[PDB]
């Protein structure tokens, strides 16, 4: 299941280490890929590229690790993400761009935030860059890639869910996303709450399903529900627009429905135009 989830093809690793480290062409590719991963697929204009770093990069004086750090600490990166977002959101973006994953638990935010508060941002990026994870998955000669999709390293299951919150498509950039300018994985991270996977748009209608548990039914039924034979299936929906009496209200929401009624409820929801995000047993 590749196309719907969004992982079109992320199925190899681009090193630059070679006898021909320049390789006369391959270095161009490596530079592009670093820009795509570190700057979050931002469209960097030609004039503002970090020419000084690339100089040392071909010369061999700096490794790919040093190149990634140079971009990460350069003001090019800072203007896009660091200066303009909530600090916790910046921590999330750092995890996405440098270590190719999402925060697995609240302790990650605790540690990185404390670094930022005392040592400064430069030290925060340093910690990501030289963390054991970066040193192992990548190797100072391998451009960072989104390894969060693969589960081989050893990670909390929630990680998979969480990475799909940050990656909202191949085309998407974190400077320009549906929920941008505010924390995307903050309220959930404190409560260790799982997230339903929101597939990115693909030649069909899209309705980004925000999931604030402030006003939603619980994940479980927490009762007998209607009491009819069979368990209680929780159905989510986003784009409810047709029946606006005061204005529909809470256009994106979930309903806990007993099994026997699901069919009926389904058609009602389809009538309003909302595309059901998920139907999970509760």
């Amino acid at each position: 299941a590749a196309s719907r989830l969004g992982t079109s093809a992320f199925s190899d690793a681009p090193p630059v280490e070679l006898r021909a480290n320049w390789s006369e062409e391959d270095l161009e590719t490596v530079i592009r890929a670093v820009y795509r991963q570190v700057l979050g697929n931002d469209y960097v204009m030609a004039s503002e590229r970090l020419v000084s770093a690339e100089s040392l990069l071909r010369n061999g004086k700096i490794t790919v690790r040093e190149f990634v750090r140079a971009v990460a600490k350069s003001e090019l990166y800072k203007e896009k993400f660091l200066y303009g977002n909530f600090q916790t959101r910046v921590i999330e973006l750092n995890y996405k761009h440098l270590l190719g994953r999402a925060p697995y638990d609240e302790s990650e935010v605790i540690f990185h935030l404390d670094l930022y508060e005392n040592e400064g941002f430069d030290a925060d990026i340093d910690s990501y860059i030289d963390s054991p994870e970066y040193t192992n998955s990548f190797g100072d000669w391998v451009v960072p890639y989104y390894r969060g999709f693969n589960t081989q390293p050893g990670q909390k299951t929630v990680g998979f869910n969480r990475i799909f919150r940050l990656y909202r498509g191949y085309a998407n950039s974190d400077r320009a996303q549906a929920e941008g300018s505010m924390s995307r994985l903050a309220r959930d991270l404190a409560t260790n709450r799982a997230n339903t996977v929101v597939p990115p748009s693909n030649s069909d209608t899209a309705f980004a399903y925000y999931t604030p548990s402030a006003d939603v039914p619980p994940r479980a039924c927490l009762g007998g529900s209607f009491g009819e034979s069979g368990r209680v299936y929780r159905i989510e929906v986003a784009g409810i627009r047709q029946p606006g009496y005061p204005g529909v209200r809470r256009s994106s929401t979930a309903f806990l429905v007993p099994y026997e009624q699901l069919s009926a409820k389904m058609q009602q929801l389809q009538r309003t135009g909302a595309r059901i995000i998920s139907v999970n047993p509760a």
Binding site: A13, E17, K61, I62, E66, D130, T135, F138, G139, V142
Partner: protein, 62 residues
Amino acid sequence: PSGARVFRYEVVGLRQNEETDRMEFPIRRSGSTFITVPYNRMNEEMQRITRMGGKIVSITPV
């Protein structure tokens, strides 16, 4: 300024496949490798190179 003044490190061939099996990328060449280390990260870089294994041949202030 308690910085700059970079030092070049020269590294003995990392035997590899000895406590570094976990490393994802396979090392492609051992030894005859020069790494530009800055003064501020010199402490950490010593730790990393030695933890991986191997030795340092020479250190040249540039």
